[PDB]
Structure 1
Amino acid sequence: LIPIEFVLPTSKTPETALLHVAGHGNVEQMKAQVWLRALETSVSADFYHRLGPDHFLLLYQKKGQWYEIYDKYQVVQTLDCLRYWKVLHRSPGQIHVVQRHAPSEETLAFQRQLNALIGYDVTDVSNVHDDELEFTRRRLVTPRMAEVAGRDPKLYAMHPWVTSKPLPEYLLKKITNNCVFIVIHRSTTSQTIKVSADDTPGTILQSFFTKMAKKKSLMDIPESQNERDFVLRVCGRDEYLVGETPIKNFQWVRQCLKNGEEIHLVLDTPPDPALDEVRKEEWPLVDDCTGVTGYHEQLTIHGKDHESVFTVSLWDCDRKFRVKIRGIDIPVLPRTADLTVFVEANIQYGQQVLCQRRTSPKPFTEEVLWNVWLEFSIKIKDLPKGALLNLQIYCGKKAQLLYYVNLLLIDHRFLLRHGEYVLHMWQLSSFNADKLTSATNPDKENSMSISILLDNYCHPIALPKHRPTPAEMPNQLRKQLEAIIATDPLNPLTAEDKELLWHFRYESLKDPKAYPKLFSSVKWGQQEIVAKTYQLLAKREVWDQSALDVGLTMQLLDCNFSDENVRAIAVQKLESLEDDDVLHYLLQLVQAVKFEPYHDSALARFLLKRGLRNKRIGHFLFWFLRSEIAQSRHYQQRFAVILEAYLRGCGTAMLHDFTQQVQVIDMLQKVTIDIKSLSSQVISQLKQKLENLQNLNLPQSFRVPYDPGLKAGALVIEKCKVMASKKKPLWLEFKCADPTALSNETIGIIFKHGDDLRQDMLILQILRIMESIWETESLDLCLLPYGCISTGDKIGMIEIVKDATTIAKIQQFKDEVLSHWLKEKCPIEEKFQAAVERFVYSCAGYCVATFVLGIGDRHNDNIMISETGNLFHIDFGERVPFVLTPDFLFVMGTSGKKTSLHFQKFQDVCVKAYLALRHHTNLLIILFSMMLMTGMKEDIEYIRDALTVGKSEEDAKKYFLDQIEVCRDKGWTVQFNWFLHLVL
């Protein structure tokens, strides 16, 4: 019997009891057993009588850290505390039975603020038939803690935005003789200095504080404080330039050089790290060994007698899987019609339906009862870890699906399901990301409910952990293998191809690019086949030193891969990405968490430590999770837990900043409501509300949602308005809150209600990623990717571009209007020529982008143009490659059949870009697919037939040139169609 010392609460000094408990006795039994000992030994039996064994927590110290044994359905021998003690040679150990306490006022208060920010009460335990979520909240403390305590204070407060990529071609020129000029401002003295483009900010100061040492009186810098008591800062923004990096490897410097604007800096004091302090944790640390159950050699009945059997390994079972369907009951029949209905149950892994079943048709009345066993051909020992029991109701007189719901056959504990479950069914009004959801409908009032019985077992049926345990083919097969590894990602693998890949499994492993094809062939419905795969992955030195290819590392995080080890390596490969890289794929990692079948995974844990290490990832992470919670019922609870874990780590500084932004969003949502709910009176009412809102303690300064470095301040009420739109968006216009801004320009924003803007942040996150691609080739197609965001229930905060105008207005179809419009705005010939330069370098970028993505055909009314000639699209809600009306080419020097020195530089540029994308066909094909599913196969076939997957460069280089011409004939007819239906 294992001896343990228990430090009983009450004494003159605390009293301790030494108890011998069974190694395989359960913890709950230990609670009762300890209780009896205290009653027998207590000096005050009344204290231990009134209390109960269920009102205490068992704490133990591990290297100065207190841990609590959260799980109660566990045997003593399995506890990590025993392991730790024996390694340190402690026996018997000490377990403190500390009385539980209720939450205090401050703790309840802090939880209240967090609940408001998240938009969901994480403490809710109503619509859950398991304890997964609460376990996740407790366990995710360990991630946070170390990252919170592993941060650099100064660099985390100032958060410099550096990059590592080399300068492109079109920016090396703009650094002449390896030099750059910086306009340093100090109070009223703004002087220019010249430094080398490979000098670190720590030096730019040294020289400055030496040159001006004699002239420091003019600068007004404090005399006592030296060149270390200051840091450069972007004037008009909260973007410091600190650290030890070249002054060319920042992101503000590279933006200015692209726009040809001098760099303006101001000396400032360092932000105090004391303003980022975090609340000390309230919860104790959950026990480390909680996700581990043991190997098949300890969970099996065989080799043991019935005396000592406590746990049964799943692989010992050999029976066909079986469930019992009792029936369904709709509180009120949605429609009275002569139709029959029948239930069906399926087992699934990813999108692979391993097996199905059905039941006899019966009339669709308000309550249907069957009480029938359905037995599946799959053996109970063949169930994989992420098995999903999918229950679906079909109708008929084909078969019209009505409802579906999902259950986890092996829950988060490695324990088969056993009991009676009543589940409420979602309603569908081929596949989607929402359909893989293990969440139950919260509408328990008018939603069908189905009752299932899964047989009970005398012992827990646990899933064991795999044990890591330890000529050339004919050229034809090797050549045939090479062909399969080298097809388009969407290309399927035939059964014969699967045998070749699975049979040749140790040959492909060494080839890093074959992984998403190797593991698509493994048969997951067989215990040994999965066992073979784990041995194969034991040694993966090739994939641990191969160049990171985000296209590949994204392929593995798709739906198909429902494994824990296949996904874990991909995420391990993502752990190389840099902050700049991370910020481009955020909204696509977040929207891919909808696929992890469990809550606490490596992807989700990765999303938070990167977040809590950088400020700019956290800011945008906050807003991307926040939108999903507020408008996606199927994944609210997973996302709520994730955000809460982060919000406790960011800090009091960013927490204040996240409060203020939420207030403004909520108040302005109310303002929208008023006007929308119900004609110059509309304008007058808006002014009253806006003036009242400013008087309604509107925050005097808040960071813009889509630009953390820009603090908008007091509103400007004479420029706000309500456009002539049925949705009536607010043309809000704020002003900067920084005195150091060098211009009095405002900050325009559009606050729109009545549409879902999750797509717009994607078709605008995709393009910005395409812009980086065309930068990997030192091309600068000049797109205009503006800011946009979705913050809640059909509300959006779009950014305003200064000096813009819609083409539908530059036409309010006369052909020559466009050219004369730009001439009027900039009659100066030099400016006009420079303007038409951009109108081409960006009329391609958009011809390309909206053709690759398949959204080229658009109405004239959704296109715009800035006064400097930059074209750009907006409102991302017979075909045409894109919108290339004659007016556009009219401005390039074209008419009829002519070719202008610009018309050719368009075609040249156009294609020169298309071919750049083809070099990343895999990435564009994984990101298209992910979008589609987790956004809104024949649909996804467009991104090949039009991205030229197959034919070679020349075959494409003439593909898109033929496309450019196709449009040249269309001219002004498609736009007709558009406006025609939109006016009819």
Structure 2
Amino acid sequence: LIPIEFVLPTSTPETALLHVAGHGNVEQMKAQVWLRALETSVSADFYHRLGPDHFLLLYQKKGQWYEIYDKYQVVQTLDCLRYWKVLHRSPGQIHVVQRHAPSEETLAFQRQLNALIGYDVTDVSNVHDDELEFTRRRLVTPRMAEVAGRDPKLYAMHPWVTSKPLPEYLLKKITNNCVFIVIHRSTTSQTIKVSADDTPGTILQSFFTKMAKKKSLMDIPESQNERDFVLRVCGRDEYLVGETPIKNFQWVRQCLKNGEEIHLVLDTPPDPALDEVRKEEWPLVDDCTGVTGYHEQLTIHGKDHESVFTVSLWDCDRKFRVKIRGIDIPVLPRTADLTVFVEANIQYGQQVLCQRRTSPKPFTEEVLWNVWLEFSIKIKDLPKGALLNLQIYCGKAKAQLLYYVNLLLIDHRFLLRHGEYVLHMWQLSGGSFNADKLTSATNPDKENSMSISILLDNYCHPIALPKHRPTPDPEVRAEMPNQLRKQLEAIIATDPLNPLTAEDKELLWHFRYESLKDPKAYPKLFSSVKWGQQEIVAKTYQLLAKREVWDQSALDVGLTMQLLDCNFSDENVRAIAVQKLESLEDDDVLHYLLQLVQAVKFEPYHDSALARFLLKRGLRNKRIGHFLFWFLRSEIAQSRHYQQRFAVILEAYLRGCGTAMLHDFTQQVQVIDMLQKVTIDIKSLSSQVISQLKQKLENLQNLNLPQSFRVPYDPGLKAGALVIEKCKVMASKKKPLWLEFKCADPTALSNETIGIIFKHGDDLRQDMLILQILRIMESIWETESLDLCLLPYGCISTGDKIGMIEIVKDATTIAKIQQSTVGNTGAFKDEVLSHWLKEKCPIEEKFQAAVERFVYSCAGYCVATFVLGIGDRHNDNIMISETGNLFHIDFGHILKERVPFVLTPDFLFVMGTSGKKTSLHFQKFQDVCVKAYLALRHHTNLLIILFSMMLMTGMPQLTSKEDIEYIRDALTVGKSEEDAKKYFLDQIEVCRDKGWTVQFNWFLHLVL
């Protein structure tokens, strides 16, 4: 028993002292308190009118009010008891406070958040548990912890720095380690020369000291000094602040690369008071909430049946058992004489532990089985993240899968499910595996979908999964035979996709302490664990508990992104993978941000280490949050399988950004909504279209169209008023909108507009994935001092089938250039592109620079598309700039005569090789291609774990390993560098052999 003094609400404040059963539940304690208050209370009428469900239990832990939220938790495990014992408090005080209705302002803020998210997080219509409300309550602690510890000025100004070394192609441009900076204030400009290692503070101090005599001109109030001002990129919002050398800001680098002057304006710092956060609504929820305890406390052995309150899961030695009652759909999908049957499978990740199925029956509108399916697996061997995978197969008179649904077998509170269930199944519209097939959510449409009724057994007491006790492990040993060590090393050195034979698994698990010394063997050593046996799991936790080498190992993103895949569903492998990502810079979390957001789809539980890591890194930088918001909102609007989890995460984020960051999000979701209704109306219904659009656009300025908003794909650029004399509708099947705004910042150095393409009726997520991979590949090439002059433009998906795309100025499609002379027949002259480029560039030096740029760009885009396997493109999807750069567009689809990549005789003519002749430029092109290919091969594991994800969370249609082996074949895994060089040169000759043979066939296919 435990003495506790509850402070009741009725007044002086009445108190009740009670003794609580240690192993009882919170609901039991509530009932006992209510029963005592019914008698002790002077006025029991107040307690008779209401009940125990109209009050909250709050306790103060170090100046903050925590709440006992779980109405079943074991009283013994309440963290309040531990806190009191540490402080030597007895009896503890627990305040009982009555529930109140939310104020009006709370409801208004909630509605605003729901509007921003695009989904009602407060809905409880499609749920069979309280996992999502419990996650909302739990995520309060990380948000407060991160908000409290943020530097106001650095948050408000978000400098964009990096620590990587300066690539060699940039040290040539820095002469004598000095950089020229142009400093504007008002109508005055001055060029200063500074050292490349000077922090912005030193730069200012030097400036002021120089111009101290002439401060009057610059218009710097005499009473003000270098501490009142900051530097700001002219035109954009990219403050240069903090303690960092001038050479480490991504702006300065970018400007150097492009050979452009660095223009900076003196400005006043933003006031951090604009980033105040609304006071938290809910009290914090006790930390030890999802904690169950150890086996010794939970076991039923060595106890009396009258003293049993919980049963350990590891005490059940029976075989699992599920009852299939029946299936039922309102209307048959297909009309024929068909047989159907149900298949149940236990599943861990992608592994099918067991499998049972029922006898076929004719496919009527309601099929009834009432059959107990028994699985070979015992109830004690069930692992945390298992998933009963119910599937409906149809046979004629093989079998074709029709519907699927998943049900967890251990909830977020470490308890075994029980009772009847009625689950609404998804439909396999459209391969062997996809991410969509792991979701544990049910179909929202409850009126026109198939439903499976199951029944899991009921038990007298809750059955809980104990917690592995961290006990010292016995294992010593000695050296390994030099044959077995060589065999093990050979096993470890294989590519990530090489399957493992049973002998390999046995060898890895036998010498599981030698493998622990090599980090690279972790992704294979954890694939050989028999997750269907409790003993081997408790032996795996005793091994993971000694994690010295992994902690001391250097960070490799290609290895740590391999433990987050769908193969590992254990929370302790993922936990360490995240512990290893928590040391990544802020410049490198932006490269892999989209992959890490897509990797949340593989998490069996809503609350996870990876979700908390994204939440924390979002609340710390003001540029990793602009993109987390738009990725989560792009996923919510389209993926009905995972919209509720992303909605919860996005709500958790949006309650800590600030008021400015919410104003911006609002002023952008408005622009977007207005331009999507415009698009819709335009399509629904020549000069017609022209005038119609002009009208609508000019009348949107009589609505509430924001006059200044941040471009969604470039958070640093502010766009203002439309230029309605430059907009139009592009000539295409889907009629994109060609909008052109103008910069809202009056400090800009030019009158150039901001071009934006608004698309509708198409999904752009695949474009985003491909562009992210291109940026990753350009970082890899930068690592080795290679400048292939790629041009990944800005693309972003904003909602359902809609999107926004950047416009590249002075660019045109190669198809238009060909049609400018040939016409629209299907012929292709070979010298058109060269003549066009020469016309654009009259000066010889400009022409040579453009041709070199062309060369490099083509080499890099051929290599990239060959590696990705999407190099077979129509000539209409490749554009070229007036400076010679070349790039691809419209990747949203590509994801009997075939080519590896587009190298039509026009490119080769630009280079100089008219036929099979060779020229200096085509030799330079070959050398660049070979170097780039070898550099890419250096990161084979990374690119092989990024492609697999691109495919499992990308294209909606299911995929098989045959789809993934292409990347293995393209990178020439396991071959010497000479062999790879020969292979790529052979591919080049293959493209140099077909000429216009595939282009013509694309033209014919499109015309026909």
TM interval, shorter chain, is: over 0.9
Q: CA deviation at 1:981?
A: 0.4
SS of aligned partner of 2:353:
strand
Q: Distance in 2 between matches of 1:272 and 1:230?
A: 12
Q: Distance in 2 between matches of 1:817 and 1:863?
A: 15
Q: Distance in 1 between matches of 2:799 and 2:788?
A: 33
Match of 1:733 in 2: 740
Q: Distance in 2 between matches of 1:27 and 1:643?
A: 31
Find the partner of 2:460 among 451, 458, 461.
Answer: 458
Q: CA deviation at 1:619?
A: 0.1
Q: CA deviation at 1:26?
A: 2.3
Q: CA deviation at 1:16?
A: 1.5
Q: Is the 8 A contact 2:24 2:309 kept in 1?
A: no
Match of 1:836 in 2: 851
Q: Distance in 2 between matches of 1:239 and 1:515?
A: 41
Q: CA deviation at 1:855?
A: 0.3
- 1:313-349 Cα distance to aligned partner (Å, 9 max, x none): 1111000110000100111112220110001100000
SS of aligned partner of 2:796:
coil
Q: CA deviation at 1:944?
A: 1.1
Q: Is the 8 A contact 2:4 2:19 kept in 1?
A: yes
SS of aligned partner of 1:705:
coil
SS of aligned partner of 1:831:
helix
Q: Is the 8 A contact 2:340 2:360 kept in 1?
A: yes
Q: Distance in 1 between matches of 2:994 and 2:782?
A: 32
Q: CA deviation at 1:415?
A: 0.7
Q: CA deviation at 1:889?
A: 1.1
- 1:558-588 Cα distance to aligned partner (Å, 9 max, x none): 0000000011000110011111100000110
SS of aligned partner of 1:939:
helix
- 1:275-310 Cα distance to aligned partner (Å, 9 max, x none): 000000010101111111011111111121212111
Q: CA deviation at 1:843?
A: 0.4
SS of aligned partner of 2:887:
strand
Q: CA deviation at 1:468?
A: 1.2
SS of aligned partner of 1:248:
helix
Q: Distance in 2 between matches of 1:559 and 1:908?
A: 39
Percent identical among aligned pairs is 100
Q: Distance in 1 between matches of 2:52 and 2:927?
A: 79
- 1:823-861 Cα distance to aligned partner (Å, 9 max, x none): 001111111011001000000111001100000100001
Q: CA deviation at 1:679?
A: 2.4
State how 1:203-242 maps to structure 2 within 5 Å: 203-242=202-241
Q: CA deviation at 1:617?
A: 0.2
Q: CA deviation at 1:791?
A: 0.9
Unaligned runs of 5+ in 1: none
Q: CA deviation at 1:38?
A: 2.2
Match of 2:797 in 1: 790
Q: CA deviation at 1:41?
A: 2.4
Q: CA deviation at 1:24?
A: 2.1
Q: CA deviation at 1:951?
A: 0.5
Find the partner of 1:852 among 849, 867, 870.
Answer: 867
Q: CA deviation at 1:900?
A: 1.1
SS of aligned partner of 2:769:
coil
Farther-moved stretch of structure 1 (272-281 vs 969-978) = 969-978
Farther-moved stretch of structure 1 (32-41 vs 649-658) = 32-41
Q: CA deviation at 1:143?
A: 0.6
SS of aligned partner of 1:241:
coil
Q: CA deviation at 1:36?
A: 2.6
- 1:603-658 Cα distance to aligned partner (Å, 9 max, x none): 01100100000000000000000011000000010000000000000000100000
Q: CA deviation at 1:52?
A: 1.1
Farther-moved stretch of structure 1 (106-115 vs 328-337) = 328-337
Match of 1:150 in 2: 149
- 1:482-509 Cα distance to aligned partner (Å, 9 max, x none): 0000001110111000000010100000
Q: CA deviation at 1:458?
A: 0.4
Q: CA deviation at 1:44?
A: 2.4
Q: Distance in 1 between matches of 2:312 and 2:951?
A: 40
Q: Distance in 2 between matches of 1:539 and 1:30?
A: 40
Farther-moved stretch of structure 1 (873-882 vs 549-558) = 873-882
Q: Distance in 2 between matches of 1:73 and 1:810?
A: 72
Q: Distance in 2 between matches of 1:437 and 1:25?
A: 34
Q: Distance in 1 between matches of 2:104 and 2:37?
A: 32
Q: Distance in 1 between matches of 2:876 and 2:392?
A: 44
Farther-moved stretch of structure 1 (599-608 vs 892-901) = 892-901
Q: Is the 8 A contact 2:439 2:641 kept in 1?
A: yes
SS of aligned partner of 1:226:
coil
Q: Distance in 2 between matches of 1:335 and 1:932?
A: 30
Match of 2:822 in 1: none
Match of 1:273 in 2: 272
Q: Is the 8 A contact 2:246 2:252 kept in 1?
A: yes
Q: CA deviation at 1:193?
A: 0.2
Q: CA deviation at 1:19?
A: 1.4
Q: CA deviation at 1:34?
A: 1.6
Q: CA deviation at 1:879?
A: 2.2
Q: Distance in 1 between matches of 2:965 and 2:120?
A: 41
Q: CA deviation at 1:27?
A: 1.9
Q: CA deviation at 1:680?
A: 1.0
Q: Please give the TM-score of this superposition, normalised by the length of structure 2.
A: 0.97
Q: CA deviation at 1:29?
A: 2.4
Q: CA deviation at 1:418?
A: 0.6
Match of 2:65 in 1: 66
Matched residues, number: 982
Q: CA deviation at 1:773?
A: 0.4
SS of aligned partner of 1:181:
strand
Farther-moved stretch of structure 1 (175-184 vs 872-881) = 872-881
Q: CA deviation at 1:220?
A: 1.0
Q: Distance in 2 between matches of 1:941 and 1:95?
A: 61
Q: Please identify runs of 4+ aligned residues in structure 1 that moved more than 4 A.
A: none
Match of 2:941 in 1: 922
Q: Distance in 2 between matches of 1:445 and 1:218?
A: 74
SS of aligned partner of 1:792:
coil
Farther-moved stretch of structure 1 (653-662 vs 47-56) = 47-56
SS of aligned partner of 1:501:
helix
Q: Distance in 2 between matches of 1:412 and 1:75?
A: 15
Find the partner of 2:811 among 801, 804, 807.
Answer: 804
Q: Distance in 1 between matches of 2:323 and 2:41?
A: 51
Q: Distance in 2 between matches of 1:239 and 1:692?
A: 33
Match of 1:873 in 2: 888
Farther-moved stretch of structure 1 (298-307 vs 475-484) = 298-307
- 1:357-395 Cα distance to aligned partner (Å, 9 max, x none): 011110000000010000000000110000100000001
Q: Distance in 2 between matches of 1:166 and 1:298?
A: 55
Q: CA deviation at 1:880?
A: 1.1
Q: Distance in 2 between matches of 1:648 and 1:325?
A: 43
Q: Is the 8 A contact 2:73 2:289 kept in 1?
A: no
Q: Distance in 1 between matches of 2:7 and 2:925?
A: 81
Q: Is the 8 A contact 2:509 2:529 kept in 1?
A: yes
Q: CA deviation at 1:46?
A: 2.1
Q: Is the 8 A contact 2:322 2:373 kept in 1?
A: yes
Q: CA deviation at 1:45?
A: 2.5
Unaligned runs of 5+ in 2: 472-477, 820-827, 956-960
SS of aligned partner of 2:177:
coil
Q: CA deviation at 1:32?
A: 2.3
Q: Is the 8 A contact 2:729 2:738 kept in 1?
A: yes
Q: CA deviation at 1:25?
A: 2.6
Q: Is the 8 A contact 2:234 2:265 kept in 1?
A: yes
Q: CA deviation at 1:222?
A: 1.5
Q: Is the 8 A contact 2:77 2:291 kept in 1?
A: no
Find the partner of 1:433 among 413, 432, 435.
Answer: 435
Q: CA deviation at 1:514?
A: 0.4
Q: Distance in 2 between matches of 1:684 and 1:886?
A: 42
Q: Is the 8 A contact 2:146 2:620 kept in 1?
A: yes
Q: Distance in 2 between matches of 1:900 and 1:27?
A: 82
Q: Is the 8 A contact 2:295 2:312 kept in 1?
A: yes
Q: Is the 8 A contact 2:274 2:659 kept in 1?
A: yes
- 1:48-100 Cα distance to aligned partner (Å, 9 max, x none): 22121110000000000100000001232221111110110000000000011
- 1:383-408 Cα distance to aligned partner (Å, 9 max, x none): 00001000000010200111000000
Q: Is the 8 A contact 2:813 2:876 kept in 1?
A: yes
Q: Distance in 1 between matches of 2:688 and 2:457?
A: 68
Q: Distance in 1 between matches of 2:842 and 2:545?
A: 69
Match of 1:969 in 2: 993
Q: Distance in 2 between matches of 1:662 and 1:486?
A: 49
Q: Distance in 1 between matches of 2:25 and 2:603?
A: 32
Q: CA deviation at 1:693?
A: 0.9
